[PDB]
Amino acid sequence: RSANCLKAEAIHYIGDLVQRTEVELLKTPNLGKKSLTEIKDVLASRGLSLG
DNA sequence: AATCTATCACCGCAAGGGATAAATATCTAACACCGTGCGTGTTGACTATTTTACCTCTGGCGGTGATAATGGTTGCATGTACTAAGGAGGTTGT
Incomplete structure (x- = not known):
């Protein structure tokens, strides 16, 4: 439910x-652990980025 | 604001449905030709575009009739409920 409580921020x-x-x-609701931890490097494998 | 165990379940990850796009084959449409006929051109005779002239329409408006005719029309303002004002005039008072 990381998927539900993320999209609930209208993001x-x-x-x-x-x-x-x-x-x-x-800024989101809940979204408290495994989701939040390390997905930020596979985000860069479909191909996005932060900075 | 970090930690997770223990929810209700999304992901974990097998299956399979529709899709669309390729190739084919059909459709139509765009065109180039041709032929028709119309609105391509000047000229010419017509007759009635316009003007002015003349002879003689339509409608401008001014003018007023006489056997005599010589006491008139007009219908419903409103019917209630109030009550404030002015009007009357005799008089018993100021």
Whole structure:
């Protein structure tokens, strides 16, 4: 349910997730652990990035 | 604001449905030709485009009739409920 509680912030789509750098990332509901931990490098394997 | 165990379940990851795009084959449409006929051109005779002239329409409006005719029309303002004002005039009072 990481999928439910993320898209509940109306960040439903990958296009703006590109803004969510490790300085202000948390604004979302719940989304508390394995999701939040390391997915940020496989994000860069379909091909996106942060900075 | 970090930790996770233990929810209700999404992912874990097998299957299979539709799709679309390739190739084929059909359709139509765009064109280039041709032929028709119309609105390509000047000229010419017509007759009635316009003007002015003349002879003689339509409608401008001014003018007023006489056997005599010589006491008139007009219908419903409103019917209630109030009550404030002015009007009357005799008089018993100021």
